[PDB]
Design a protein around this nucleic acid. Sequence first.
RNA 1: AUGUGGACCCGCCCCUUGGGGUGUGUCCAAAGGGCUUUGCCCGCUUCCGGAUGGGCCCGCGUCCCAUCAGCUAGUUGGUGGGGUAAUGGCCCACCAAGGCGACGACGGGUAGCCGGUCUGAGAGGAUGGCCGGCCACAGGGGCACUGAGACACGGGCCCCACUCCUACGGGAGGCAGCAGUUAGGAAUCUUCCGCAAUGGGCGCAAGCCUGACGGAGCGACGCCGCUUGGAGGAAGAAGCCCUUCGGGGUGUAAACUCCUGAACCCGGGACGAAACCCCCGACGAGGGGACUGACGGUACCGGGGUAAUAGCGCCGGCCAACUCCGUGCCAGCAGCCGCGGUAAUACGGAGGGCGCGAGCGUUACCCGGAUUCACUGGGCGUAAAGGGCGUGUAGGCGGCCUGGGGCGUCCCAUGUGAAAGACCACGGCUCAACCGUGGGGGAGCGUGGGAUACGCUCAGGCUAGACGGUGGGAGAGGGUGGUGGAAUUCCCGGAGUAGCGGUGAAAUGCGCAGAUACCGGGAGGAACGCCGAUGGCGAAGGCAGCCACCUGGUCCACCCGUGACGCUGAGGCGCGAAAGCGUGGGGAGCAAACCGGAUUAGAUACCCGGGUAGUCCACGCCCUAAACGAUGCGCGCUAGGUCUCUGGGUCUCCUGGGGGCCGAAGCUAACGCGUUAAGCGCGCCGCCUGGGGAGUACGGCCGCAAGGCUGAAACUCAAAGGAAUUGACGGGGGCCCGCACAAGCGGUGGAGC
RNA 2: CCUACGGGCAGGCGCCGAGGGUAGGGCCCGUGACUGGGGCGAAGUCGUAACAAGGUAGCUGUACCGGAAGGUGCGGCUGGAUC
Lengths: 138, 125
Amino acid sequence: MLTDPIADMLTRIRNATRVYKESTDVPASRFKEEILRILAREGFIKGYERVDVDGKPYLRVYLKYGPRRQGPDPRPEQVIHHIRRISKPGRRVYVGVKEIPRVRRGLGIAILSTSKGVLTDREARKLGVGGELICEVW
Amino acid sequence: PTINQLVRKGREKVRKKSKVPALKGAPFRRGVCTVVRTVTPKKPNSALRKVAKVRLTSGYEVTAYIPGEGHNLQEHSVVLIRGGRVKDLPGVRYHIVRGVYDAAGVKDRKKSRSKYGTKKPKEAA
RNA sequence: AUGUGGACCCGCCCCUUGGGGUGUGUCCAAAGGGCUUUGCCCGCUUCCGGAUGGGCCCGCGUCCCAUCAGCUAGUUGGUGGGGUAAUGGCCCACCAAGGCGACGACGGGUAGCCGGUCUGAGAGGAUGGCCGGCCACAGGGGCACUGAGACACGGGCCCCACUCCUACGGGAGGCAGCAGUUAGGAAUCUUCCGCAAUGGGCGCAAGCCUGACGGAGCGACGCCGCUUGGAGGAAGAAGCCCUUCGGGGUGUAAACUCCUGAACCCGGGACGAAACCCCCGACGAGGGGACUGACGGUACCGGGGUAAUAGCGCCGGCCAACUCCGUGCCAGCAGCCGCGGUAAUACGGAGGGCGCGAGCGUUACCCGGAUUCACUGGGCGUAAAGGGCGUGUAGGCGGCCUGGGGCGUCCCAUGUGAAAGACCACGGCUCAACCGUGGGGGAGCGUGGGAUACGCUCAGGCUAGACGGUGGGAGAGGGUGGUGGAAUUCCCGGAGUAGCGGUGAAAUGCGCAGAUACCGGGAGGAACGCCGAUGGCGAAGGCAGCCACCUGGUCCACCCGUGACGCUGAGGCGCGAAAGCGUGGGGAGCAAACCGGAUUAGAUACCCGGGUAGUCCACGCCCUAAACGAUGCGCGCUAGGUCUCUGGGUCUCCUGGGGGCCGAAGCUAACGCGUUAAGCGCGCCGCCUGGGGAGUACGGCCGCAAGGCUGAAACUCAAAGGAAUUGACGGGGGCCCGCACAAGCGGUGGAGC
RNA sequence: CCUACGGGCAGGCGCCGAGGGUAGGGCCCGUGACUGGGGCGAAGUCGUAACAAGGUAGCUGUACCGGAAGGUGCGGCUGGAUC
Ligand SMILES: NC[C@@H]1O[C@H](O[C@H]2[C@@H](O)[C@H](O[C@@H]3[C@@H](O)[C@H](N)C[C@H](N)[C@H]3O[C@H]3O[C@H](CO)[C@@H](O)[C@H](O)[C@H]3N)O[C@@H]2CO)[C@H](N)[C@@H](O)[C@@H]1O
Ligand SMILES: NC[C@@H]1O[C@H](O[C@H]2[C@@H](O)[C@H](O[C@@H]3[C@@H](O)[C@H](N)C[C@H](N)[C@H]3O[C@H]3O[C@H](CO)[C@@H](O)[C@H](O)[C@H]3N)O[C@@H]2CO)[C@H](N)[C@@H](O)[C@@H]1O
Ligand SMILES: NC[C@@H]1O[C@H](O[C@H]2[C@@H](O)[C@H](O[C@@H]3[C@@H](O)[C@H](N)C[C@H](N)[C@H]3O[C@H]3O[C@H](CO)[C@@H](O)[C@H](O)[C@H]3N)O[C@@H]2CO)[C@H](N)[C@@H](O)[C@@H]1O
Ligand SMILES: NC[C@@H]1O[C@H](O[C@H]2[C@@H](O)[C@H](O[C@@H]3[C@@H](O)[C@H](N)C[C@H](N)[C@H]3O[C@H]3O[C@H](CO)[C@@H](O)[C@H](O)[C@H]3N)O[C@@H]2CO)[C@H](N)[C@@H](O)[C@@H]1O
Ligand SMILES: [Mg+2]
Ligand SMILES: [Mg+2]
Ligand SMILES: [Mg+2]
Ligand SMILES: [Mg+2]
Ligand SMILES: [Mg+2]
Ligand SMILES: [Mg+2]
Ligand SMILES: [Mg+2]
Ligand SMILES: [Mg+2]
Ligand SMILES: [Mg+2]
Ligand SMILES: [Mg+2]
Ligand SMILES: [Mg+2]
Ligand SMILES: [Mg+2]
Ligand SMILES: [Mg+2]
Ligand SMILES: [Mg+2]
Ligand SMILES: [Mg+2]
Ligand SMILES: [Mg+2]
Ligand SMILES: [Mg+2]
Ligand SMILES: [Mg+2]
Ligand SMILES: [Mg+2]
Ligand SMILES: [Mg+2]
Ligand SMILES: [Mg+2]
Ligand SMILES: [Mg+2]
Ligand SMILES: [Mg+2]
Ligand SMILES: [Mg+2]
Ligand SMILES: [Mg+2]
Ligand SMILES: [Mg+2]
Ligand SMILES: [Mg+2]
Ligand SMILES: [Mg+2]
Ligand SMILES: [Mg+2]
Ligand SMILES: [Mg+2]
Ligand SMILES: [Mg+2]
Ligand SMILES: [Mg+2]
Ligand SMILES: [Mg+2]
Ligand SMILES: [Mg+2]
Ligand SMILES: [Mg+2]
Ligand SMILES: [Mg+2]
Ligand SMILES: [Mg+2]
Ligand SMILES: [Mg+2]
Ligand SMILES: [Mg+2]
Ligand SMILES: [Mg+2]
Ligand SMILES: [Mg+2]
Ligand SMILES: [Mg+2]
Ligand SMILES: [Mg+2]
Ligand SMILES: [Mg+2]
Ligand SMILES: [Mg+2]
Ligand SMILES: [Mg+2]
Ligand SMILES: [Mg+2]
Ligand SMILES: [Mg+2]
Ligand SMILES: [Mg+2]
Ligand SMILES: [Mg+2]
Ligand SMILES: [Mg+2]
Ligand SMILES: [Mg+2]
Ligand SMILES: [Mg+2]
Ligand SMILES: [Mg+2]
Ligand SMILES: [Mg+2]
Ligand SMILES: [Mg+2]
Ligand SMILES: [Mg+2]
Ligand SMILES: [Mg+2]
Ligand SMILES: [Mg+2]
Ligand SMILES: [Mg+2]
Ligand SMILES: [Mg+2]
Ligand SMILES: [Mg+2]
């Protein structure tokens, strides 16, 4: 039935990027959109947009890579090197603000759902809150 | 296993098995020699290895190795056992400690003297 | 007797579990002593309040075995009593029929719990010794008395066991207080000094008691601090060791020269001690006064002063340190790998070297390394590991939109987290160890306030999941009944005659009671040739002549219906090849066992000839497997190409479902996998944790039995494994050579020499 | 026995009761005549099952048989080589 739509979304991204796709659709959810917003603001994706696929709500998601590279294998560096669920149906992970982790000494994000909305670690730490630790992206 | 599975079952802590009933772990146990035999090794070794079957205070009758150049042990000898298998001799899991009770320490031993239990010699010292 | 008051019953207010108040009625107090003696000091009574200490109850937390699965009859609740300071099945009478359990009851094992301690990057693991806190115990079992408080270590009673006294009637005793003795053991201290300090009991006080305590004694048992000297001092003594015979080492090390001066001797000499008490003041505040030291003639200060202890382990690799001799698979070393069989850096000694140093090694135990129980942080195609398959219970997990609640979650404030210990300052002992002061953290839990993204929940909505409807399909899916032809055996008939059969070769065997081969007829049993596939169907096992009936699944088209109705699934229940079992049929062919013949050194086999169970049917058991894709189920996501089975379309081509092959990205130890993943992700289940012992023993469950499921330990090894590499080998393959054999001609083996 | 005549004390009976006994159940250890296998130990005996088509492909559940490895039946697997 699809147990974790967020893990799904993340993985669609992980997969499309590994073959340098220009875009992926992912079935649309408000929650999903909020995570993308962060994702876009932080420059992991180009951006995203609502669309209908067989007349059903998706979110097309424009991916984004490095430049062409030199020697053998000139496949671009990836912008999303790593993207990975934390909290999951099997095992939710919640943090207080004092235990929000520093992802790759801050060269990476952690998206994070709080009662003051979905936030990155920095946004949420300055806003002084914690909550469900959704995923870490570097 | 899944998390739900760990929650239901958990992991199992691994019990470590004693190599040595000098009974209660106790670092040394005193006994009385019974047979002071010679035994041949196995595997790829050859020699005539000196051995005591020992009745212990701990209740156990066990076989122990008599280390050192040569020894002074006969059939009622009374000795301290220490643990330390011998490896070429099967079923020999303990050594006798030399220098204690009726196991005299090794004479003529200049080097590693404190194992073998032989006091400081006195010519250039 | 007095009753400030308090207690009880009844009532009434307030308050809400038995908390305050109030009104009749009843009931309850007391002790005296001392004086520097008319006014104080110590006491006594009742009441209310505080302080301290406790009892009871509750939430949460607190080890191993499920090879302990069901436990309970004061049991569970109730009404009324009793008992208590007090609640309560704490106890009792009666009533009801209850209580607990896989979220692990009941049972067994093991253990005092904690603050802490050790370890670890942390998470975690181990631990509860000193010190502090709580419990429990006082030779073993019970019991109550007294009392604010005990069911009372040095109080009482009784029973039990042991020791001592005994005039045999009876008694006495309880070091898990301080010392100390003995026994056990690898092993654990003085029958010391003192109440001077701190604390404790009684006392108006003086004081008395205090093995609490403060000290000292003994053990390198640990930690810290310090000594065994310091500066000169040779191209370099001797001795010992190497040597390529030239030289090298020990080595500034020593001898020797200055210098300092642990030990030891002389002198002074503590802090810890100001209070209790007495005097002035008032017996209060304040002031004055006197006593008091176990440690100890110690610490510490001053004068003098002697060069004055070094050991243990290691030197093959892991690991820092190499040579000569001795030794010859011996003696021995050995943590693991392994050394030793005449040149051993591995054994023993020497020299030399490395490491620590009043210590150094050993054994034992904990954590570490071990991401080797993996939460952080592992795995299951072939290495250990996917349950034989399903159905589905509990449980776990759950698509999109809106609103309510705020249980999880997050935030703020606050109470709590004692002391010690831990972290950081600054201080005290010459330092440190040890210690004083101050600061800082700190999981967890309580109370009040707030947030609402996600999780939960309540209510509402949707249609992408799921299910359903209409129409169309392919199929060895299953069950029952029927039926067809070929073949084998047997029986009858004809014709026919000397063998058939069988093997490497044979023989046993069958055949003149006429076999074999051939034709005709009949009986029966079992199995379905071509089609047939690299095919199809089923969840697995597994399913194949044809027909009919009954019946399970599943695919496509329309996009009509319901509205998250979903996934997974411990246990349960069902299915489950062959062999095997029971009862009863049946029995052609085949065929364990068995009876024979060959072969062979032997042949309890391979080959041949017989042949019973069985193989077949029905019903009932068994429940296993190389039950294999050796690959759990479900869902989403990530190039293609090619062949095939089966739907639909606008039928060159497009679009579903299924079976193969090659292969993107990617993964893999490799082999390989690769939209039919072993790729990328989520959910839920099952399983693994070195090899052998062992799928054994024990126990339980099941079974008619055979057996099946579950499943150890002792002991023992340093591997056991997987994939791939190079070879080598094959009574594997292909290609090919050589007087290798074949074709030839002459020899040797015989005789003499 | 004491009494202020209210009662108290002795004493007696009873319930509970440590422990004791008898019969039946269970559980834990010892010790054991006799018996079954197992590990380990340079150079003992019989064959040769397996590894190369191991000279009968192997392995496997099961059933029977046999000094021993094993062999045979039936069914399964390829984790069999040779075209
Ligand atoms: N072992 C192979 C199979 O694992 C299967 O399930 C597992 C796999 O599907 C998958 O595991 C993946 C693995 O596929 C793939 N090779 C990559 C990944 N490392 C693994 O993931 C797993 O392990 C990592 C840690 O290594 C975890 O962080 C992660 O959460 C966990 N899913 O997710 C499951 C997690 O164990 C089935 N159990 C069975 O088919 C078989 O056991
Ligand atoms: N509380 C005041 C004093 O504090 C001390 O606590 C402190 C000291 O014990 C200790 O501090 C000192 C440190 O300050 C000083 N700068 C260095 C010294 N190594 C530390 O000492 C500590 O550490 C070492 C090793 O860990 C050990 O000797 C021992 O654990 C302890 N002495 O750690 C704490 C913080 O510095 C005492 N433990 C305590 O008995 C005393 O009261
Ligand atoms: N072939 C018939 C079918 O087989 C199944 O089972 C039946 C038969 O197969 C089975 O065997 C029959 C038997 O009926 C009858 N009493 C004896 C007869 N010889 C048998 O005959 C059948 O089976 C055997 C098996 O090889 C053969 O003869 C042949 O294959 C077939 N005709 O016995 C069952 C009933 O007696 C199904 N039950 C049914 O569909 C149908 O009878
Ligand atoms: N190894 C334990 C088990 O039992 C047997 O193994 C034991 C005996 O069979 C085997 O015996 C062998 C023998 O077969 C072989 N042909 C001759 C050899 N001398 C024997 O050797 C045995 O005995 C000698 C004394 O004679 C010992 O020195 C030696 O340790 C041991 N290997 O040696 C084993 C010693 O344990 C089976 N081989 C095997 O099933 C299984 O591994
Ligand atoms: Mg994608
Ligand atoms: Mg908090
Ligand atoms: Mg050797
Ligand atoms: Mg009054
Ligand atoms: Mg009165
Ligand atoms: Mg009551
Ligand atoms: Mg105990
Ligand atoms: Mg660790
Ligand atoms: Mg503990
Ligand atoms: Mg007692
Ligand atoms: Mg008590
Ligand atoms: Mg006493
Ligand atoms: Mg003794
Ligand atoms: Mg005192
Ligand atoms: Mg005092
Ligand atoms: Mg000097
Ligand atoms: Mg001088
Ligand atoms: Mg070295
Ligand atoms: Mg040595
Ligand atoms: Mg030599
Ligand atoms: Mg060595
Ligand atoms: Mg040596
Ligand atoms: Mg670990
Ligand atoms: Mg893990
Ligand atoms: Mg592993
Ligand atoms: Mg395996
Ligand atoms: Mg399977
Ligand atoms: Mg299911
Ligand atoms: Mg369910
Ligand atoms: Mg949801
Ligand atoms: Mg809340
Ligand atoms: Mg504290
Ligand atoms: Mg200082
Ligand atoms: Mg709180
Ligand atoms: Mg709804
Ligand atoms: Mg005929
Ligand atoms: Mg099959
Ligand atoms: Mg519709
Ligand atoms: Mg509707
Ligand atoms: Mg069956
Ligand atoms: Mg059968
Ligand atoms: Mg039968
Ligand atoms: Mg035969
Ligand atoms: Mg035959
Ligand atoms: Mg036959
Ligand atoms: Mg496949
Ligand atoms: Mg396909
Ligand atoms: Mg492929
Ligand atoms: Mg094992
Ligand atoms: Mg291999
Ligand atoms: Mg090879
Ligand atoms: Mg020739
Ligand atoms: Mg001749
Ligand atoms: Mg009485
Ligand atoms: Mg032996
Ligand atoms: Mg064979
Ligand atoms: Mg062959
Ligand atoms: Mg063989
Ligand atoms: Mg063979
Ligand atoms: Mg078989
Ligand atoms: Mg046979
Ligand atoms: Mg077979």
